[PDB]
Amino acid sequence: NSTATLCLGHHAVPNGTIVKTITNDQIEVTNATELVQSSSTGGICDSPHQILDGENCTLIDALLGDPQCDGFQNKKWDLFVERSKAYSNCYPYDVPDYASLRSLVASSGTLEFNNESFNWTGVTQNGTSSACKRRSNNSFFSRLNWLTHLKFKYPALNVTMPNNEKFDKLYIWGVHHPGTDNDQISLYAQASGRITVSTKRSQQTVIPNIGSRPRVRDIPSRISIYWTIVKPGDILLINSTGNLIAPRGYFKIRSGKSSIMRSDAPIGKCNSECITPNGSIPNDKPFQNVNRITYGACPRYVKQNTLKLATGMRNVPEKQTAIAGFIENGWEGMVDGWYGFRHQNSEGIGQAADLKSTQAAINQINGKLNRLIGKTNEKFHQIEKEFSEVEGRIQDLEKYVEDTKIDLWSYNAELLVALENQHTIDLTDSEMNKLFERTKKQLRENAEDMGNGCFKIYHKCDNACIGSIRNGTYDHDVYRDEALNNRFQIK
Amino acid sequence: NSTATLCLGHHAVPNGTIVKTITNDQIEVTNATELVQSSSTGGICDSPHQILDGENCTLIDALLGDPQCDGFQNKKWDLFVERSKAYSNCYPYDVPDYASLRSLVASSGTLEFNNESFNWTGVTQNGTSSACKRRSNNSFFSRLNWLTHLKFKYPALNVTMPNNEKFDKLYIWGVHHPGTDNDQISLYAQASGRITVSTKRSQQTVIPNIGSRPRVRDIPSRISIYWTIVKPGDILLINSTGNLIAPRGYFKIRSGKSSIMRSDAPIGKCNSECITPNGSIPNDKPFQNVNRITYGACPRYVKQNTLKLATGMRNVPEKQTAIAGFIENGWEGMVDGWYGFRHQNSEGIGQAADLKSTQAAINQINGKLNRLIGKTNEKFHQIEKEFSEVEGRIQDLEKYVEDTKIDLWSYNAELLVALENQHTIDLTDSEMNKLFERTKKQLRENAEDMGNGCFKIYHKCDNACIGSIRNGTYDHDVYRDEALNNRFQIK
Amino acid sequence: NSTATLCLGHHAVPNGTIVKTITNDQIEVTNATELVQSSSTGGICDSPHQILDGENCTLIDALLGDPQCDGFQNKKWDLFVERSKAYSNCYPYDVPDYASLRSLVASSGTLEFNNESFNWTGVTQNGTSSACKRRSNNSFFSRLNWLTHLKFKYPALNVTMPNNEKFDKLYIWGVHHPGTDNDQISLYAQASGRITVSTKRSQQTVIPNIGSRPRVRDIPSRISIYWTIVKPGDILLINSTGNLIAPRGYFKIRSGKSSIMRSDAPIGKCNSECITPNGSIPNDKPFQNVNRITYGACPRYVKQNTLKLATGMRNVPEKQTAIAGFIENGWEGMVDGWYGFRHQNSEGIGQAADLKSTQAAINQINGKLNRLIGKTNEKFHQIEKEFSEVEGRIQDLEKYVEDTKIDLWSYNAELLVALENQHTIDLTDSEMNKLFERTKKQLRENAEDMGNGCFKIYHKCDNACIGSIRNGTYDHDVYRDEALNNRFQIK
């Protein structure tokens, strides 16, 4: 009736989602996406990393050559998987600093072994035991050589092996601790004496200690395992009068991205970049709360089990019912755009989406999605994070380092999502406000702001006229005389 | 005189406080609150954590059973407090890896001890010394058993103790290092020989070393202390020909939240969640600069001694004196609200608070207070952070881990408070701006913006009229003819 | 022609720089500055820290007194620089826990040595070797004393040295491991026996181990090095029957800010606070990607090789050509200010800078520069971050601690710069918007907003009139009758 109404508005949905911003602990938005990965398939995917399933073998048993581990000879891995069911089935042994030898072999990622011809003239080689059976016969660790007397003589060993290669050699060797004096004499022909293994740059001396230990596979003796790395140009010197469990050669030691993980998860024929002890997990999300132990391109571990990133504007119910604009009011019936126009004129009541504002909001949200989704970084060999034995100081430090790290990342995650969500609310609010301001400016003196996100346009404004406003081609001069007469009439 | 003035404004206070934002290193606000706890009472509150005051006893002395520590037998703790005055008063001893045994016992949180009947047939038990008096008589550590020859014989000990319990057993034992060959023979009847303590899964051999050490309580000998954990189903085997300081049984070893702290603070009858070596501290604040060593639900340690969180808007002096609005001007006389209205009309000059805007600002500030205040998290046994001896590598790492952690938290604290304060300034500024905009919209063509946060209303607007604007019931149509004539008159 | 145009605008430059904000991965601004230091001179500046260039000597060789290191006696340092070319040229030795002794001496920062008169009655002193020549003669480590038999007797040593000083004493000593039984007898007159060095609070026993090691400088024997710290009031007791490499006195041990660094960078005559192995670097910037190893007041190490901080507003091309304001349009021709006014009136078309808005933007940007530039903090002795040997557990932890730290700082840097740049864009946009709003308010009913950042002023407004608007002295009442007639005329 000589005027029209033009309202600016934004969509709303019936099923919104609650997120956290800096301004609000809980604010409902039109949509959100989860940034914490909280589930796994439960299987370790055999691709794209080279998996070695230890089965009944620990890495150290596979290294020494426990008979059940013969199948592992010379294999490589990106990730060696050690099973809780694993058990030793050879001569009872220990490794002082077991954790370090495990770690250095794990990180090297290879069991490649090269035999060498040591001169063991004057002694008997290849000692075996019923505690270490291979194909039902008494045997021993494959990579070790139990030397004993020859004709009740054990002449002092003073044996050399030069490293004339261009790579390092890793030697694994041991000392036999007999149960009794009787065993000492029966095995080596004389009283126990120390073993010294040296190079130009290092030395280790180990004393065999006679005594009963609790029987394991009916063996009260023990073997203690040691290692030596020999550089190119250096020489291994082995010096012993008995009790030597000698090396048969060396392991290659390599550097790269290999590691070891304790897990009982089955190995699957599938492809996944991120491995945890619970199974492989997708790495689309920036964070995860599945396990602090990871290998590969993995989301960062956080304490939160959910963090929702807003991917839409504030969700505002439509006030119940004159058309009305965005002031405390969303439009559930606007389904082809995020922002738009509703009008009332001579020809009826209509709605149209505004593409520009809708696309600007969507583009920006997609931009932050692109920064946060599918952008994980790889980590490989790290520190251990679960422990089967009590140890004190070093373990306290390992645990505190990891606890510290997780709390700092959990804090970063919490802040990041609150900041991002505040920014999303601000940028989506801003597109609405800019649309309203642009429209106000077009209309000049031909309309007044009704306070509800709508303009009273003080002239006849048919469908084409409204279209000209929406398209940005409205010429205010054309209508100004009509509008001014209508606005500043005296009633 | 045919018009009225309506000004929008906000309060101001005579005693504002300076805070930091992202925009300003120093900006005065109406009020702030401190987020760094910087004082302690100076006492350790005995509630709600179970405190054990070591008095003259270290934990290790209480474990071994130094006579002055007999009162500690079998006690438990959440926090064992070790005093600087503590001193040993029994046989001179050392503990290789003292720090680890201290740590593992501290974390276990119990001195529960179960006696066992070891078969020491063939030797004399219960050796004592004048260096370790109990009730004025020569004595020894309560939990240890100094075995010596019987009739100048010391038959080889080969003694067993199975763990048929469903929990782990912690055994503490030792080796006696005699001052001279004469002592060796007088005590054990033969030359010194090694001690081996083993289980199915582990072994330790220790060599007694004869020699003079500086006398302590007139004793040139030493005892060295060792420990062994025996799992259920396993067996302790002790094998010795002399110099054995034997266990009398085992300690329970538990897991939980127990720890140990070095402090000289007195223990008080009071209740506080957070304990530091300086005393308990309140844990209302998110940060603290009292001590990096903490136990319980504690604020996080930061380097800053103060961080002030704004709890009010910018504080702006009232310009000296026509009423005027918020543009570069606060209202010290507005004491019943944070924002409001001042008017001049036919009936005088008045002021009224706006509840809605005031409450919206207060609610939001209370929200951020609720997130930051009284929300501390608990930590228990951690790593040591002060050291009485120089050690090198491990200590360097312990110190660097803690330094690293504190710098990262101090950074987080600094950023958090700057961000929060910027947000507080922004949300309080926003309530002022929204109040002004809402008012502008009500007034439509009946008023003009005077540029100083006030409107010139171009009609007679009595107290009820002004009230209708403040209440949001003003009907612009009622006054529009009058206002338009007044606005667009030609003078 | 009875009207004027007044446009508000901001500068633009032909050569802008791309930065990252929270809103945009790439946004062009007028200027930026680099926050990551990525180059070094390549030399270590000898000022202001006290540098000690080890040349051919490691710290440990300088400590023991290898002949080529005699020049180092008693010197101090802030930073000891160890060269890759360094080599030992004396008796072949090792140090169990070499890394710790290196670290504790490095951190102490002094080689100050005080000779003491030990009573070595009954033995020969000052043993020497061809493996350790000094001025072409057979010699030995300067700070050690190789004792051997006197007249084929080596009476048991039981020797004391009290610490009656008020500072700690650091004693360095050793054990000689002879190649053969023949050497043992030729040197010490009897079979090898253990060495015990003790105090009231500590003890160490070391066993000499006879055996061939690979010859070095024709020596198949080895010396193993040990250390003891003796507190004031305590006593050093040395107890040996042979194989003792005795101390000649003690080192002072101090506490302070000293460290050690591995580098081949030459030492220069220059002054720089921050030292890295690549050379000294400037410390103006808050971050650096030169080296994770640093000493002194240094930028923090990050993974990024560049982080650009915006130091100007968004850079917006001038739309091609009616004068026009800031809406999607910057002014390349405005060179004497950041914001300003362009006008068209009766007297022509002019431009003027607005000082207030320009200065407010510049001041704020300078403020954030002042917070970020030249504000680095000092760190001194830390942990090692590069390793020449494989070690396992401890090294894994050292590496993980540093990796963890760097990732957290790299994250903080990335967020900080994105946040700061967003704030810079917001504050510079805000000065433009405030200038426009201030102008709008002055003009009252005398102008209309043309939508392009300009006002149509509906009255004759000559150069003085425009000046009154720019100066904030424009009196709208003077022109209102003229303007209203022009605005609300009917055409």
Ligand SMILES: CC(=O)N[C@@H]1[C@@H](O)[C@H](O[C@@H]2O[C@H](CO[C@]3(C(=O)O)C[C@H](O)[C@@H](NC(C)=O)[C@H]([C@H](O)[C@H](O)CO)O3)[C@H](O)[C@H](O)[C@H]2O)[C@@H](CO)O[C@H]1O
């Ligand atoms: C050298 C020798 O033959 N010694 C005999 C002892 O082995 C034997 O004590 C019994 O030993 C039993 C285990 O027998 C082996 C084994 O481990 O299988 C037989 C091995 O050939 C022998 N290995 C070598 C390289 O000689 C090995 C070794 O002696 C022990 O493992 C060392 O602990 O023993 C089993 O443990 C019985 O319980 C045990 O009594 C005694 C008595 O028969 O005679 C010795 O001559």
Ligand SMILES: CC(=O)N[C@@H]1[C@@H](O)[C@H](O[C@@H]2O[C@H](CO[C@]3(C(=O)O)C[C@H](O)[C@@H](NC(C)=O)[C@H]([C@H](O)[C@H](O)CO)O3)[C@H](O)[C@H](O)[C@H]2O)[C@@H](CO)O[C@H]1O
């Ligand atoms: C076995 C014995 O009686 N040995 C005598 C030596 O103790 C003694 O040397 C003197 O020893 C003095 C301390 O006497 C005790 C003690 O610690 O109180 C007496 C204890 O009963 C004895 N403990 C046991 C279990 O036999 C203990 C032990 O021998 C030492 O502590 C080992 O160091 O000694 C005190 O230290 C005197 O300064 C010291 O001369 C000599 C000489 O009298 O005779 C030995 O038979």
Ligand SMILES: CC(=O)N[C@@H]1[C@@H](O)[C@H](O[C@@H]2O[C@H](CO[C@]3(C(=O)O)C[C@H](O)[C@@H](NC(C)=O)[C@H]([C@H](O)[C@H](O)CO)O3)[C@H](O)[C@H](O)[C@H]2O)[C@@H](CO)O[C@H]1O
């Ligand atoms: C005590 C003595 O003189 N022993 C003689 C052996 O040294 C010698 O074996 C030869 O030793 C050669 C090195 O000679 C020195 C040295 O290091 O320069 C000479 C030193 O004076 C002696 N040091 C002391 C304090 O006595 C030192 C020491 O014996 C060795 O370093 C211990 O390893 O030896 C060189 O190594 C030759 O290759 C080696 O054969 C034998 C045979 O000549 O006679 C011993 O009496």
Ligand SMILES: *[C@@H]1O[C@H](CO)[C@@H](O[C@@H]2O[C@H](CO)[C@@H](O[C@H]3O[C@H](CO)[C@@H](O)[C@H](O)[C@@H]3O)[C@H](O)[C@H]2NC(C)=O)[C@H](O)[C@H]1NC(C)=O
């Ligand atoms: C030191 O004490 C040890 C524990 O008491 C003891 O070990 C025990 O030795 C017996 C036999 O002497 C073993 O008994 C075994 O006997 C049958 C054959 O009759 C075997 O088939 C079984 O394996 C059976 O167990 C015990 O197993 C063994 N116990 C432990 C815990 O090791 C040592 O022999 C004693 N040492 C000396 C030198 O006397």
Ligand SMILES: *[C@@H]1O[C@H](CO)[C@@H](O[C@@H]2O[C@H](CO)[C@@H](O[C@H]3O[C@H](CO)[C@@H](O)[C@H](O)[C@@H]3O)[C@H](O)[C@H]2NC(C)=O)[C@H](O)[C@H]1NC(C)=O
């Ligand atoms: C190795 O040298 C040691 C230090 O010189 C020496 O220890 C000293 O021994 C004397 C006695 O021989 C102690 O003197 C004590 O004598 C009176 C009784 O007359 C006691 O009441 C006092 O305790 C007094 O101190 C020294 O205390 C002691 N010094 C130290 C530092 O331990 C060893 O005895 C020597 N060892 C051998 C085997 O000869």
Ligand SMILES: *[C@@H]1O[C@H](CO)[C@@H](O[C@@H]2O[C@H](CO)[C@@H](O[C@H]3O[C@H](CO)[C@@H](O)[C@H](O)[C@@H]3O)[C@H](O)[C@H]2NC(C)=O)[C@H](O)[C@H]1NC(C)=O
């Ligand atoms: C244990 O075996 C060792 C390695 O086979 C052996 O060491 C070698 O000893 C020879 C001499 O016996 C040294 O040869 C040196 O001889 C000339 C003089 O003719 C010297 O000028 C040279 O230095 C030359 O090298 C070897 O250097 C040495 N090799 C190594 C690697 O140390 C030990 O001697 C044997 N030990 C015993 C006790 O027999």
Ligand SMILES: *[C@@H]1O[C@H](CO)[C@@H](O[C@@H]2O[C@H](CO)[C@@H](O)[C@H](O)[C@H]2NC(C)=O)[C@H](O)[C@H]1NC(C)=O
């Ligand atoms: C290292 O090897 C040497 C021989 O090269 C051993 O020395 C011999 O030991 C025997 C037995 O004790 C003696 O009877 C010989 O006289 C020694 N030979 C020489 C040349 O001295 C030595 O025992 C071995 N070392 C170890 C620790 O086993």
Ligand SMILES: *[C@@H]1O[C@H](CO)[C@@H](O[C@@H]2O[C@H](CO)[C@@H](O)[C@H](O)[C@H]2NC(C)=O)[C@H](O)[C@H]1NC(C)=O
């Ligand atoms: C561990 O106990 C065994 C006995 O079970 C000890 O062996 C005896 O030692 C004595 C003294 O040296 C010898 O005379 C006996 O002949 C040994 N008995 C047997 C059966 O061999 C052994 O010495 C003890 N071990 C330690 C380290 O003390």
Ligand SMILES: *[C@@H]1O[C@H](CO)[C@@H](O[C@@H]2O[C@H](CO)[C@@H](O)[C@H](O)[C@H]2NC(C)=O)[C@H](O)[C@H]1NC(C)=O
């Ligand atoms: C520490 O010094 C003592 C002497 O104070 C040494 O004891 C003597 O050792 C010799 C050689 O073995 C014996 O013949 C004497 O009888 C011992 N004297 C006494 C009083 O017992 C002892 O050997 C030295 N200890 C070490 C580890 O070298």
Ligand SMILES: *[C@@H]1O[C@H](CO)[C@@H](O)[C@H](O)[C@H]1NC(C)=O
């Ligand atoms: C909600 O957001 C995510 C991320 O943009 C998108 O993949 C998903 O399809 C959206 N859901 C709906 C119903 O729009």
Ligand SMILES: *[C@@H]1O[C@H](CO)[C@@H](O)[C@H](O)[C@H]1NC(C)=O
């Ligand atoms: C592992 O050991 C179990 C239990 O002894 C056995 O049944 C199984 O077949 C073994 N698996 C392999 C792959 O050797």
Ligand SMILES: *[C@@H]1O[C@H](CO)[C@@H](O)[C@H](O)[C@H]1NC(C)=O
């Ligand atoms: C993964 O395994 C850990 C350790 O057993 C367990 O605490 C956690 O609940 C598991 N997470 C999932 C998603 O299975």
Ligand SMILES: *[C@@H]1O[C@H](CO)[C@@H](O)[C@H](O)[C@H]1NC(C)=O
């Ligand atoms: C200032 O702020 C704190 C926190 O809101 C409040 O407890 C305190 O009472 C306030 N002081 C005044 C005078 O309003």
Ligand SMILES: *[C@@H]1O[C@H](CO)[C@@H](O)[C@H](O)[C@H]1NC(C)=O
């Ligand atoms: C602790 O020792 C001191 C000094 O010897 C003594 O005076 C005090 O009574 C002792 N306190 C306790 C509780 O035993």
Ligand SMILES: *[C@@H]1O[C@H](CO)[C@@H](O)[C@H](O)[C@H]1NC(C)=O
């Ligand atoms: C707490 O104790 C530490 C260490 O003695 C001291 O540096 C610090 O100043 C103390 N703080 C307070 C608030 O007493």
Ligand SMILES: *[C@@H]1O[C@H](CO)[C@@H](O)[C@H](O)[C@H]1NC(C)=O
């Ligand atoms: C750009 O910014 C930096 C930091 O403010 C300043 O030092 C430099 O001179 C500026 N360059 C120009 C051309 O304005």
